[PDB]
Paper text:
The final step in the pathway is catalyzed by a 2-epimerase, which utilizes UDP-2,3-diacetamido-2,3-dideoxy-d-glucuronic acid as its substrate. The focus of this investigation is on the ORF WP_011172736, which we demonstrate encodes for a 2-epimerase. We have also demonstrated that the T. thermophilus enzyme is allosterically regulated by UDP-GlcNAc.
Although UDP-GlcNAc was observed binding in structure 4, it was never included in the crystallization trials (structure 10). As a consequence, we crystallized the apoform of the D98N variant with the assumption that UDP-GlcNAc would be found in the allosteric pocket. The crystals were obtained at pH 6.0, and the model was refined to 1.8 Å resolution (overall R-factor of 18.1%). Note that the α-carbons for the apoform of the WT enzyme and the D98N variant correspond with an RMSD of 0.9 Å.
Residue numbers in the entry:
A (entry chain B): 2 to 360
B (entry chain A): 1 to 361
Write the structure that this text describes.
């Protein structure tokens, strides 16, 4: 009764598509096609990703990437269009806001194949921010806009997109975090290995240039974390670049003052996030995950894209100026929680999307 | 110091718009220009006549792309245009009209953070399945500056959240061009002498579209009507040899005998005939605009036009070809009408206004 073709580029997009698929594959009368724009990866770490996160095997890998925006986008546009002319789907789903997303939407729309944009209406309002142009043009190219927030809805209305193409469904990444959260609790040994209890540690990740490329900020961070560790163990899966910078700056020994690890796989990282007493991070994605698992977050930046998390008191900016102050900030936010309300849907965004598709 | 302004063009109407802008840019200190054509160089006779008569410069680049699907053409043009932008490093990219070339140019530039100005911004049919509608929308939302032809286009842009400070009402550079080529036609074209015609002593017909040329009922209505008009006032009908044979085939060749049926004429000869006609009968959107520019009443043999403003100012009139008697009467009646004396598409100096805005910023 309906053929639904998903275009995905980067890993976040596979995760969103997998969540939607978990609903679509339960729907009798839906045929699904998964088009990956990039290459297959045979490496062990990659195979584990697809397997442990239950990602469907793509029907296509177009192999495109490594070039400029114009080469990657233009080749994807032609190649995706080739697939659409063979598969003739009733719907094309595009996800996130990369060049793959835009290429998928532009390929479909000129063939008059209805396009639905999963994660529509996000705006930085900075036309030069990486994904801002992709966000705007994907949204204006699409037939259905699945917004994660009311702010995104309003963003879309403001640009003259009509209300009847806009549907507030929430963030499928919340759905995915609940699914992987349950699976981690079943499968992950990371807390057993480290000898840690649920709610008995702080998780830290640091990888942004603003922190890792400044000798002074990185010293402040690492010293602050070493001080926090004395009170509550600090688990710090250190990004390899962060490690490299620490070592070059002569800051290596501080990592010996916390539980410093090599990066861990996805399910192990979910297990650490959901069971942390608090998360300290400069990652935008990790800030959202903290909220999804109702774990207080301290963001070691002077700003964040997710102001809604600050307003809801789940997240808290802590610029790394002084090690004592940062440590004390973290220790204090450890005993806070934010507003128990939903910012990004109820974890069932996937069913709401499917409902508008299976019509 | 100076600005490098690179123009992307992909269809003949874009060449005309860019040349009009360029006639101003090249007289203005502090500008270097680069012209990129997405398609091929041609050496047939009619193409050479296009470039020579309409004063179109040979592009600095011909990307040689065309003839494929939307995805093929657009995707290849996007990569190929970007290549040129990385070499030329312009300060501004200008894109024109609303074709796949336009969009490819805008998208190539915007991801390099090269300012884009869209000439002919804000047009909307409000039907996202009309040919160029997605192109219009996406080009508009990709652009840094929007050069709107009408107040309507300005409102369309504001209604999609584009702020007033990026929208400039300049008019339609096609009007500038029509005045340029009109003056040139009056200096150079001898077509009226050649035909023994007097200015305002004839009707011009041009029938281009398949909905008409390929349906024997509609084509008969048109040619039967014209042959009727011809008994009161000469009808000049430059007919493509295709459309001529299509008419011979449907059995209508005696009608082409009655009127002054011609082989295709050159561009300036057509301009000369248009501007000096008592009335123009056409199914071409472009000709409908030229009729208005030259203040010649127009009758459009279709059930619709996009250019509704011409209908509402009474310069144009829809007469779908269902009834030869009534079509002939409509022509005879409308050839003694005029529209409302109003400028719909600017003052004929849209090019100067674009140039002034670009050179300022
Ligand atoms: Cl993504
Ligand atoms: Na609640």
């Amino acid at each position: 009764w309906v053929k639904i073709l998903s275009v995905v580029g980067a890993r976040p997009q596979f995760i969103k598509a997998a969540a939607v698929s978990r609903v679509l594959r339960a729907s009798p009368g839906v045929r699904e096609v998964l088009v990956h724009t990039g290459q297959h990866y045979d490496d062990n770490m990659s195979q584990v990703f697809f397997e442990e996160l239950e990602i469907p095997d793509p029907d296509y890998h177009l192999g495109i990437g490594g070039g400029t925006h114009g080469q990657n986008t233009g080749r994807m546009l032609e190649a995706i269009e080739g697939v659409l002319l063979k598969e003739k789907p009733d719907w094309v789903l595009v996800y996130g806001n990369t060049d793959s997303t835009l290429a998928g939407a532009l390929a479909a729309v000129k063939l008059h194949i209805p396009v639905a944009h999963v994660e529509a209406g996000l705006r930085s309002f900075n036309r030069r921010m990486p994904e801002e142009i992709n966000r705007i043009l994907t949204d204006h190219a699409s037939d259905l806009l699945f917004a994660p927030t009311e702010t995104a809805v309003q963003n879309l209305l403001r640009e003259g997109i009509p209300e009847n193409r806009i549907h507030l469904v929430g963030d499928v990444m919340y759905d995915a975090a609940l699914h992987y959260g349950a699976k981690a609790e079943r499968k992950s040994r990371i807390l057993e290995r480290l000898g840690l209890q649920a709610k008995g540690y702080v998780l830290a990740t640091i990888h942004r240039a603003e922190n890792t490329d400044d000798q002074e900020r990185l010293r402040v961070i690492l010293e602050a974390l070493a001080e926090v560790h004395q009170e509550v163990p600090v688990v710090f899966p250190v990004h390899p670049r962060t490690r490299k910078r620490a070592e070059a700056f002569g800051l290596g020994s501080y990592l010996e003052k916390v539980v410093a690890l090599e990066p861990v796989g996805y399910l192990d990282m979910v297990m650490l996030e959901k069971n942390a007493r608090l998360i300290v991070t400069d990652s935008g994605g990790v800030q959202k995950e903290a909220y999804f698992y109702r774990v207080p977050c301290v963001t070691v930046r002077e700003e964040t894209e997710w102001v809604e998390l600050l307003k809801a008191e789940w997240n808290y900016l802590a610029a790394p100026q002084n090690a004592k102050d940062l440590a004390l900030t973290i220790l204090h936010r450890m005993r806070t929680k934010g507003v128990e309300i939903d910012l990004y849907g109820d974890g069932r965004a996937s069913q709401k999307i499917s409902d508008f598709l299976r019509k």
